[PDB]
Design a protein around this ligand. Structure first.
Ligand SMILES: CCCCC/C=C/C/C=C/C/C=C\C/C=C\CCCC(=O)O[C@H](COC(=O)CCCCCCCCCCCCCCCCC)COP(=O)(O)O[C@@H]1[C@H](O)[C@H](O)[C@@H](OP(=O)(O)O)[C@H](OP(=O)(O)O)[C@H]1O
Ligand SMILES: CCCCCCCCCCCCCCCCCC(=O)OC[C@H](COP(=O)(O)OCCN)OC(=O)CCCCCCCCCCCCCCCCC
Ligand SMILES: CCCCCCCCCCCCCCCCCC(=O)OC[C@H](COP(=O)(O)OCCN)OC(=O)CCCCCCCCCCCCCCCCC
Ligand SMILES: CC(C)CCC[C@@H](C)[C@H]1CC[C@H]2[C@@H]3CC=C4C[C@@H](OC(=O)CCC(=O)O)CC[C@]4(C)[C@H]3CC[C@]12C
Ligand SMILES: CC(C)CCC[C@@H](C)[C@H]1CC[C@H]2[C@@H]3CC=C4C[C@@H](OC(=O)CCC(=O)O)CC[C@]4(C)[C@H]3CC[C@]12C
Ligand SMILES: CC(C)CCC[C@@H](C)[C@H]1CC[C@H]2[C@@H]3CC=C4C[C@@H](OC(=O)CCC(=O)O)CC[C@]4(C)[C@H]3CC[C@]12C
Ligand SMILES: CC(C)CCC[C@@H](C)[C@H]1CC[C@H]2[C@@H]3CC=C4C[C@@H](O)CC[C@]4(C)[C@H]3CC[C@]12C
Ligand SMILES: CC(C)CCC[C@@H](C)[C@H]1CC[C@H]2[C@@H]3CC=C4C[C@@H](O)CC[C@]4(C)[C@H]3CC[C@]12C
Ligand SMILES: CC(C)CCC[C@@H](C)[C@H]1CC[C@H]2[C@@H]3CC=C4C[C@@H](O)CC[C@]4(C)[C@H]3CC[C@]12C
Ligand SMILES: CC(C)CCC[C@@H](C)[C@H]1CC[C@H]2[C@@H]3CC=C4C[C@@H](O)CC[C@]4(C)[C@H]3CC[C@]12C
Ligand SMILES: *[C@@H]1O[C@H](CO)[C@@H](O)[C@H](O)[C@H]1NC(C)=O
Ligand SMILES: [Ca+2]
Length: 1326
């Protein structure tokens, strides 16, 4: 039994890894066919299973006979291996048919190589240790969903079951939209009536019939996938007046707030983890290695200089004459002239390669073909001459030179491979555009951008491990999907492409679900495959998981990578700059030392050059927090007429009137009718615009007599020109429209007038300027990808209307469309796909749409189906091209976009301080003392009579079992709140109503008991008691309304039910970690309202612009501009803008209004719509994303002190416990309290602060004795003013004990730091 010492060798471990990889390949080679069909390879691979099972069992047996049982089973990975082998053995000996739950375990086999490689185990532990603090967020998220689900269950229960059945002939609805009989809901057209019962919108899956369906629908909504479809279904089922008030708060809270919480928690976790001893040591090693290299390079340059100096004096007096040539070459390959020449050559090559487009002239094609050879030869001659003038070892030292060599080799391979078989092309020749990255060399941003690449290369193994772990999880989920839905997607209609039949299809489906686009469609297909709504509805959980741990795990990989690398680069750059400054000042100070024969002026020179550059120390919040965390960790480790037109603008009440006129003009702009130009409202608006432009020009003309003013000049001049052209016929009506839409800039004038709005706009602009270099790099990478995509896909995105024809000449005439069983004659026409890659601009637009994530499966399908230059598509022709898109998703949406967030997180500047010299010592200590400054020991108001009646009620109410009963009563009432379902029996609804009755009665009894035991003016003091009373009163009003027959049409009262649905909030107070986080983030939100004002102004401006431009588009169904989504009104425009901001079909909306749309039969122009929608939508998406990210980072950095807590010396929270303890023992302040209570209070005090063990109590005595005593005054005196202050002073930054006599200086420091407190603490210092 000595297997461990003779059978646990490296080579045996690599034989077990080969068994696993082979098993993975066998699993990936399986194919699933419907209805029991099987390929011969299926049986051939099935015959391979028992050898794998035998090998696994042998390895398990060796490990058992080496380690024992319950220490071999003590490892979780060994437990997983044992479970896998046991399930395999049972399957081998299993003849019964209930093996599906056992054969689905063999998808965990790829996870076994995680156990075989401990490095992957360490990486997985590191990635999963940052997800525990996210769990509470998920809990909160679940609560939110539950709450919203309940609200849905109370409003949209069985509302989607009505449809326009024509005449009850065969019960086939004509339209897939809900009804309302008369009412403001949507009506049937033609000979149809809305009969009862029709499954629902999506096969009857998305509805609010019961709590489970409501929960699933709300979860689908929060992921912002198809929530607008549900919104429109509610709109046309019950009217559009109040449905937005349910979905807009739902989307906001469930997506934006959750994402902000996740980002903040992750940022705090990363900041805490970066300052650990291991990471700090690794960073110090990297910094030392980088610092050595600069000195080495300087010394080698010095050495080369001497080698070329001792070679000219050695020849001045064959194999030597060829070496001055090498020296001259090396002096030539390093000069600025050669650098600029090669940079211009690379720029010209980029220009030449960027002109490729579909249907280019043959002369241009030949010119580019020859220029490729010319450029390849030139680049080859610049890589050989620079390699001989520097040497192979010195040339390969720089990483970008290695990249250049790789690109040259790939280009040569492409050139030789493009002649022996000219088909498509890889596109490596475009990669030379990355050589433009030399531009940053001549700027001052070279060090910062180079340090990021240095840090990226330093931790390459970690990046590879993380990517491989992600790929392994994707493979495991693909195998699970293959087992669950493999071969079950063969429906009566066309089989969906997004299926789980083969391994490539399953892995593409899993990747698409990970991105989060159209995952609900795949979920619907899976549910339909598993039986439908009736049975098989439990197959959704898979997708649920694949969403959750698929949408918050990438944010834990790529965001972590970005934060770590960018923080490392920033710290490296800052340390390099400060070390250079220190070395320069030391050298200049030493300069004066050698010159002792005269008074030196070097000291003055270094003095005048030491403060001018000092004003560049930004010291962002992230850097300050990192420094404080480093200090704390190190301490813990160690311790173990001109005047008549200028006085009018000087008036105090002149800016306010201008602001109110600006607001009035903005409101008048909002309330405009685009579709009906000729209306009395439009005439009144024109008359008001006359007054507005008159007052604007009047105030403007008196301002020039004494950038933003430039904008005011354009506004005024455009208004004047429009008025001048108004008094004539329609001369150049397009110019009139342009000058009319120019008036939207009126709200922009408010930015300067409000100092706070101007400040926040300046902060946003500064944040934008902070990421300009990364934006340029991102644009260069996107351009390279777009050029490659143009090269790959130009011309191939053409298709005929019917798939039978493959050529343009064949796609002529008419064909038979066999849709909806009508076989209609439809014209054949050779069309082009909406999003293509004809030229670089179209490719850039398509890649932007892909990066946003909308409709990228469609472009993936089109790219895969593309065949040739002028030939129609063929399904699955080139599947490998999907790699391209995968790579794109790895680089832009995932990587590049996550380094934008990090670059804003780590460089965010504090705004509420605006100065770094306030106290230089307190960041949380100041807040900790201010908490005691403001929070007085508020009491619980114990009754003072206690004679016969009030004391009994008070004792009953404040009793712990009463609170427990209320909690159980509030938790059991929520169980009866979600237990309602559609088409329930009458007795069931009666029981539900009776239970609601008794619960409301119990809560009313509790409220009246509290009123009696506390008092009218005491119960209402609490903000929670008044909320409870409001909910009780609302429930009573609802129950009274319900008992009496409801007013059918007099007053529509159905909102009061929400009050009862509010009881959930009543149970939100039990959690001691969700309340303190929710309240903290809400209080940070309420402290930054001007960011929200800026976002609202952005939405207002874009809504007005859309109203003016695309307002009169004709409403048509089966499009993106219809009765649900249009630009007609201000509310409709805002809804469209919000839908695009979340992102549903913004590309489809853009295409639905481009310069050729059929125009409404009520407006003036017969052809309305413009090609301006491209810029409109792209700019709106970019700006909305940027401002939302800025708001998120502002909120996160407002709370960074709490998000990086490291809770062991916490002070902001222990004061709450102190107040809670003091309140119970104190009925009222009464000035002063006794002494003996404080000892039992310290005993009952939280052990985290004050006493850990029995021994530290002595230290507490050392804090009570051996210093100044408050016993000088009356012993009947409070001590909280002197106890908590002393404990918070001595817990951190203790100074009195080492001195023992310098108390007066500490008191003076405290006084000068509390200078303006209105002398309130002077009486508390004693
Ligand atoms: C992680 C998820 C997925 C990530 C997807 C994208 C991940 C990467 C995405 C973004 C990373 C890049 C961010 C910004 C890029 C560049 C910033 C500015 C340029 C920069 O970073 O500096 C380069 C980076 O080179 C590259 O490899 C160029 C970088 C090209 C990288 C493309 C390949 C990426 C695929 C990896 C393949 C393996 C590599 C490294 O800097 P360096 O080492 O060359 O610096 C030297 C140094 O300054 C020397 O003093 C100087 O010599 P002297 O003339 O004697 O002073 C050298 O001059 P030469 O340039 O003539 O040699 C410089 O080049
Ligand atoms: C940590 C998680 C915290 C979660 C907090 C959640 C906060 C947001 C909650 C949003 C709830 C308000 C929106 C209600 C959705 C309205 C749905 C609807 O269609 O209502 C119409 C309804 C009658 O339907 P109607 O079509 O008019 O008639 C035919 C069919 N009966 O009724 C009507 O006739 C109109 C009445 C509905 C519109 C007004 C309702 C009051 C809204 C006040 C503002 C929000 C109050 C928030 C209260 C929080 C606690 C619930
Ligand atoms: C500065 C502007 C705001 C800036 C926002 C900043 C971003 C925050 C998030 C975006 C908010 C977008 C809100 C969009 C709400 C859309 C509401 C809607 O569509 O409701 C429809 C209905 C009126 O729709 P409409 O077509 O105008 O009228 C039809 C009958 N004539 O609606 C009604 O009947 C409305 C009932 C009264 C609502 C008053 C508000
Ligand atoms: C990286 C730097 C050096 C590139 C600078 C920009 C140009 C190289 C790009 C930007 C605009 C691109 C143009 C974008 C739009 C067009 C129009 C296009 O012309 C046609 O499509 C005519 C055929 C037809 O539609 O019938 C030819 C490509 C061209 C000029 C592109 C050629 C390459 C251009 C000129
Ligand atoms: C300062 C910002 C928030 C813009 C103003 C807020 C808007 C949401 C409010 C303020 C004025 C409201 C407008 C107040 C007056 C009207 C006119 C109203 O139409 C009619 O009065 C019917 C008369 C006719 O049929 O001609 C339509 C709503 C509308 C523009 C309202 C739409 C919503 C508006 C634009
Ligand atoms: C963090 C990353 C690594 C996640 C994705 C891992 C990729 C390597 C996966 C996801 C997409 C997979 C691709 C999904 C689709 C295809 C096409 C397909 O190629 C075929 O020729 C299929 C053959 C057939 O038609 O039956 C299989 C390889 C490839 C690119 C797969 C290879 C492995 C890929 C590239
Ligand atoms: C001073 C501004 C900012 C506030 C007042 C502007 C809005 C509320 C005013 C300006 C002109 C007004 C319109 C003038 C004419 C008509 C025609 C008729 O159908 C009655 C209502 C209606 C449609 C008015 C509704 C209210 C209206 C749109
Ligand atoms: C790291 C950054 C700069 C990405 C640069 C590499 C990109 C452009 C490379 C990496 C892998 C490459 C793909 C690899 C394989 C194929 C299959 C071939 O039949 C067509 C080209 C295609 C689809 C390539 C296109 C270009 C591609 C996506
Ligand atoms: C906390 C959980 C476990 C118990 C409280 C949840 C109760 C109220 C929920 C959980 C699952 C729900 C059931 C889920 C499915 C159905 C089938 C439907 O055709 C009638 C309603 C019915 C029977 C639901 C009634 C309410 C229900 C029982
Ligand atoms: C002025 C600001 C928005 C700078 C952005 C300018 C560019 C991106 C925008 C501003 C106005 C736009 C124009 C507005 C209207 C039309 C008419 C249409 O039939 C063809 C396109 C064309 C000519 C647009 C092209 C793009 C355009 C020039
Ligand atoms: C069937 O249609 C006719 C007219 O097409 C109309 O009377 C009604 O909708 C139906 N007739 C019935 C229900 O008798
Ligand atoms: Ca979407």
């Amino acid at each position: 039994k000595y297997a461990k010492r003779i059978t646990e060798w490296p080579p045996f471990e690599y034989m077990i890894l080969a068994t696993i990889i082979a098993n993975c390949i066998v699993l990936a080679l399986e194919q699933h066919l419907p209805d029991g069909d099987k390929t011969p390879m299926s049986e051939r691979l099935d015959d391979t299973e028992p050898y794998f099972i035998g090998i696994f069992c042998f390895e398990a047996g060796i490990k058992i006979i080496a380690l024992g049982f319950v220490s071999y089973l003590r490892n979780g990975w060994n437990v997983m291996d044992f479970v896998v082998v046991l399930t395999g053995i049972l399957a081998t000996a299993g003849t019964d048919f209930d093996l599906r739950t056992l054969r689905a375990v063999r998808v965990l086999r790829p996870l076994k190589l995680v156990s075989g490689i401990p490095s992957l185990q360490v990486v997985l532990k590191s990635i999963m240790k940052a997800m525990v603090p996210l769990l509470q967020i998920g809990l909160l998220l679940f609560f939110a969903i539950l709450m919203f689900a309940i609200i849905g269950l109370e409003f949209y229960m069985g509302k989607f079951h009505k449809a326009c059945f024509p005449n009850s002939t065969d019960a086939e609805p004509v339209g897939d939209f809900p009804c309302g009989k008369e009412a403001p809901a949507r009506l049937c057209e033609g000979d149809t009536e809305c009969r009862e019962y029709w499954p629902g919108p999506n096969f009857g899956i998305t509805n609010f019939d019961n709590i489970l369906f409501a929960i699933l629908t709300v979860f689908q909504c929060i992921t912002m996938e198809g929530w607008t479809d549900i919104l429109y279904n509610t709109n046309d089922a019950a009217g559009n007046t109040w449905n937005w008030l349910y979905f807009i708060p739902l989307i906001i809270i469930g997506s934006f707030f959750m994402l902000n919480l996740v980002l903040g928690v992750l940022s705090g976790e990363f900041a805490k983890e970066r300052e650990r001893v291991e990471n700090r040591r690794a960073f110090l090693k990297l910094r030392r290695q980088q610092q050595i290299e600069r000195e080495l390079n300087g010394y080698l340059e010095w050495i080369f200089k001497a080698e070329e100096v001792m070679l000219a004096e050695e020849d001045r007096n064959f194999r030597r004459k060829e070496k001055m040539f090498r020296f001259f070459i090396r002096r030539m390959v390093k000069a600025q002239s050669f650098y600029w020449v090669v940079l211009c050559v690379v720029a010209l090559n980029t220009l030449c390669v960027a002109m490729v487009h579909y249907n280019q002239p043959r002369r241009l094609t030949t010119t580019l073909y020859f220029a490729e050879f010319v450029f390849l030869g030139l680049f080859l001659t610049e890589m050989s001459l620079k390699m001989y003038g520097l040497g192979p070892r010195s040339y390969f030292r720089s990483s970008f030179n290695c990249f250049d060599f790789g690109v040259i080799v790939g280009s040569v391979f492409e050139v030789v491979w493009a002649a022996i078989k000219p088909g498509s092309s890889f596109g490596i020749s475009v990669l030379r555009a990355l050589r433009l990255l030399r531009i940053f060399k001549v700027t001052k941003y070279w060090s910062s951008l180079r340090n990021l690449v240095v840090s990226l290369l330093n931790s390459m193994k970690s990046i590879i491990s993380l990517l491989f772990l992600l790929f392994l999880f994707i493979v495991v989920f693909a195998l699970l999907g293959m087992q669950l839905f493999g071969g079950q997607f063969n429906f009566q209609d066309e089989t969906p492409t997004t299926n789980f039949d083969t391994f490539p299809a399953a892995i593409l489906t899993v990747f698409q679900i990970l991105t989060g686009e159209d995952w609900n469609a795949v979920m619907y297909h899976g549910i339909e495959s598993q039986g439908g709504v009736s049975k098989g509805m439990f197959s959704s959980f898979y997708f649920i998981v694949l969403t959750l741990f698929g949408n918050y795990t990438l944010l834990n990989v790529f965001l972590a990578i970005a934060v770590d690398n960018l923080a490392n680069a920033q710290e490296l750059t800052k340390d390099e700059e400060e070390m250079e400054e220190a070395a320069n000042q030391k050298l200049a100070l030493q300069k004066a030392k050698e010159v002792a024969e005269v008074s030196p002026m070097s000291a003055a020179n270094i003095s005048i050059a030491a403060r001018q550059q000092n004003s560049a120390k930004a010291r962002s919040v992230w850097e300050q927090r990192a420094s404080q965390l480093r200090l704390q960790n190190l301490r813990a480790s160690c311790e173990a007429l001109r005047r008549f037109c200028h006085y009018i603008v000087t008036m105090r009440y002149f800016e306010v009137v201008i602001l109110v006129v600006i607001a009035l003009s903005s409101i008048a702009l909002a309330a405009e009718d685009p579709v009906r130009t000729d209306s009395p409202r439009n005439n009144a608006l024109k008359y008001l615009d006359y007054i507005f432009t008159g007052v604007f020009t009047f105030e403007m003309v008196i301002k020039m007599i004494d950038l933003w003013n430039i904008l005011d000049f354009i506004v005024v001049s455009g208004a004047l020109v429009a008025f001048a052209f108004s008094g004539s016929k329609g001369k150049d009506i397009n110019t009139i429209k342009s000058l009319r839409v120019l008036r939207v800039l009126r709200p922009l004038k408010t930015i300067k007038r409000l100092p706070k709005l101007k400040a926040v706009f300046d902060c946003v602009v500064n944040s934008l300027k902070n990421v300009l270099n990364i934006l340029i790099v991102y644009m260069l990478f996107m351009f390279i990808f777009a050029v490659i995509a143009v090269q790959l896909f130009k011309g191939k995105f053409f298709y005929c209307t019917d798939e039978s024809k493959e050529l343009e000449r064949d796609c002529r005439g008419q064909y038979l469309d066999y849709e909806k069983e009508e076989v209609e004659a439809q014209p054949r026409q050779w069309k082009k796909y909406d999003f293509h890659y004809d030229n670089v601009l179209w490719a850039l637009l398509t890649l932007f749409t892909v990066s946003t994530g909308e409709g990228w499966p469609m472009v993936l399908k089109h790219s895969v189906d593309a065949t040739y230059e002028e030939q129609g598509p063929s399904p699955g022709y080139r599947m490998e091209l999907s790699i391209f898109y995968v790579v794109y998703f790895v680089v832009f949406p995932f990587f590049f976009v996550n380094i934008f967030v990090a670059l804003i997180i780590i460089t965010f500047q504090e705004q509420g301080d605006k100065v770094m010299s306030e106290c230089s010592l307190e960041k949380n200590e100041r807040a900790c003392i201010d908490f005691a400054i403001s929070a007085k020991p508020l009491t619980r108001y114990m009754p003072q009579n206690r004679q016969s009646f009030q004391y009994k009620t008070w004792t009953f109410v404040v009793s712990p079992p009463f609170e427990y009963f209320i909690m159980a009563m509030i938790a059991l009432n929520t169980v009866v709140l979600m237990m309602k379902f559609y088409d329930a029996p009458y007795e069931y609804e009666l029981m539900l109503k009776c239970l609601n009755i008794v619960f409301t009665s119990m809560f009313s009894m509790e409220c009246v008991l509290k009123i009696i035991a506390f008092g009218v003016l005491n119960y209402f003091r609490d903000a929670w008691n008044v909320f409870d009373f409001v909910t009780v009163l609302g429930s009573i009003t609802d129950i009274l309304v319900t008992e009496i027959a409801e007013t059918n049409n007099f007053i529509n009262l159905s909102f009061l039910r929400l009050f009862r649905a509010a009881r959930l909030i009543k149970l939100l107070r039990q959690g001691y970690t969700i309340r303190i986080l929710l309240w903290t983030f809400v209080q940070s939100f309420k402290a930054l309202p001007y960011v929200c004002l800026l976002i609202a102004m952005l939405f207002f401006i874009y809504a007005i612009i859309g109203m003016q431009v695309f307002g009169n588009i004709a409403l048509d169904d089966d499009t993106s501009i219809n009765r649900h989504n249009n630009f007609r009104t201000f509310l409709q425009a805002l809804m469209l803008l919000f839908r695009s901001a979340t992102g549903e079909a913004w590309h489809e909306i853009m295409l639905s209004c481009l310069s050729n749309q059929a125009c409404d039969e009520q407006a003036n122009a017969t052809e309305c719509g413009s090609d301006f929608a491209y810029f409109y939508f792209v700019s709106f998406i970019f700006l909305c994303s940027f401002l939302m990210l800025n708001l998120f980072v502002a909120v996160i950095m407002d709370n960074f002190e709490y998000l990086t807590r490291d809770s062991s010396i916490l002070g902001p929270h222990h004061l709450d416990e102190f107040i809670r303890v003091w309140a119970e023992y104190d009925p009222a302040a009464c000035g002063r309290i006794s002494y003996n209570d404080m000892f039992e209070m310290l005993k009952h005090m939280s052990p985290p602060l004050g006493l850990g063990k029995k021994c530290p109590a002595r230290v507490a005595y050392k804090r009570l004795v051996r210093m100044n005593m408050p016993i000088s005054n009356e012993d009947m005196t409070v001590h909280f003013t002197s106890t908590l202050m002393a404990l918070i002073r001595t817990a951190l930054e203790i100074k009195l004990a080492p001195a023992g006599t310098k108390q007066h200086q500490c008191d003076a420091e405290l006084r000068k730091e509390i200078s303006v407190v209105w002398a309130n603490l002077p009486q508390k210092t004693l």
